[PDB]
Assembly symmetry: C3
Homo-oligomer: 203 residues x 3
Amino acid sequence: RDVRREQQEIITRQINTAPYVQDAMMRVVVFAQYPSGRYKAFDYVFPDYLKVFLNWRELLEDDTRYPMGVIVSFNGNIDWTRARVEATNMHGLNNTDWREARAWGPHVICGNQLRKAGHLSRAVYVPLDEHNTVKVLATARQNRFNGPQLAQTLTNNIVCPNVIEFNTESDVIDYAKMAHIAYIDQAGLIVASSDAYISGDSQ
Amino acid sequence: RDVRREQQEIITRQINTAPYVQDAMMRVVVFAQYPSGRYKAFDYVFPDYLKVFLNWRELLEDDTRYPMGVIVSFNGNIDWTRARVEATNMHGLNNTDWREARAWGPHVICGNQLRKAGHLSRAVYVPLDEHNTVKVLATARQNRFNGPQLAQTLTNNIVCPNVIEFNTESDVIDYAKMAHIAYIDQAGLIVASSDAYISGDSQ
Amino acid sequence: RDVRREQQEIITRQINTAPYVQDAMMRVVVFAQYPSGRYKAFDYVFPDYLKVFLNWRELLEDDTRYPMGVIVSFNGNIDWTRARVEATNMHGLNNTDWREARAWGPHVICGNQLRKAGHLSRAVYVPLDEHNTVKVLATARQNRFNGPQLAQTLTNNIVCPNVIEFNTESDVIDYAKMAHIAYIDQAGLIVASSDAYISGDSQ
């Protein structure tokens, strides 16, 4: 008899399920934390796959200009068995001698290193030293990579990056909440998530 | 008996047909019109496919700094049934809530919204509001996306972008004419085209 | 009986062979030589393929600001029958009229124009005039482009570019030596290589 409630339930379910449709968007954000207490976010929206290399220059606030670390926030129907992050050297290498470097290092960040922030989101904190660059891979969960489809996947995958500066963690946090993306605050708490709740945190 | 004329005819036909060869170049230009009367062109040449995201910063003249709109000029052997443009928000999303956004919106600009500017060219005017970004997709008309070929298509597709500033529409127009690309002037007229004519506009 | 020597031999062989493993890194560097005697290097590390377009702006030192030419240094398990360089115009075209331009020009730089600098490295010097841009293609030697694999190749290919300024050729040379990449000095000599020697140049 409560169709108003049922409709609101389906709307909530729709929001939570819409990201699993084949042409849905995914969202990966790299939050960089600076000694000054400021943050910079590298915010990517994309439908199929995301390959990211952040060089040392882009990572500078613009070394107390260099981030103490990053929070990497993965959101959407992402293949969690392949999602990964690694901190490479200033050349983007995972071995100082390129001749023994590889696409990914033997200790790449993946698996349970990515903390669950809801069904749609995972987040990981990665400390950085002044000589680090950052690599991230995120792919849509299967298969759009197979056969004929790959061509449509390649041509339709327009990655839309934005860089956003925040004066304080409060701005970062409110941003994550209104953007519906995972974020871990300075105390280690999951303070934002992609998951829609019909009542919010009412328990 | 007029082989001089016949040769000139074949040269004209060669120019008009050369873009249909499998490794020919295509050219897509995004002309941004500013309140000041100045323009900025994002000029891309590419052989296989073009995926473009123009963020709000790139769109600024450098808000009366923000474009009133863009003319998107598509040129070459482009798949016209898939060529498309859309104006997304500042994040590159076609829904404010990313969880319900998709690679393309339900109202994407395509079909007869692209005005014929000759056999080789189509052009469309898209008005913009201060919070808009621009996405463009253009692919070569079929199949180089199929099977073994896809690899060569991926590896050979080097997109060559140039940004060009113009003080006035006259400079924009003369540029389009000498570049052989479609352009629509402020009065709505097609003033440039990719099509070569043996006598010019002699009728 | 000299296992210390044998171990060092295998280490040397390992260094020389490691680049031929399927997920090994490759390294392509474009060294730009300026009239001032300064250089700028565009240094790319990547595991599968590299498509590069350097526009006229990026080529400026920042016209005596424009390079006299570039040394292109290719390093790794690169498909040498497809490695190529070409100098295009300011639009990235190999014909002034785009309608008759192609992905590559009829005179592209390849084959024995690339000088052998060891088994792992080739290098070529390309003179430039003020109106030139630079294109480079390098692909991993086969097949990771075939069938199912192509998807992993596409998603794993994160190109990591760095731009590096050098005050003098000496800095360029020491860089190449410590980076283990091919470089040709001002006198035409191969002064750096990717090849590891157990004794260095002891002959």
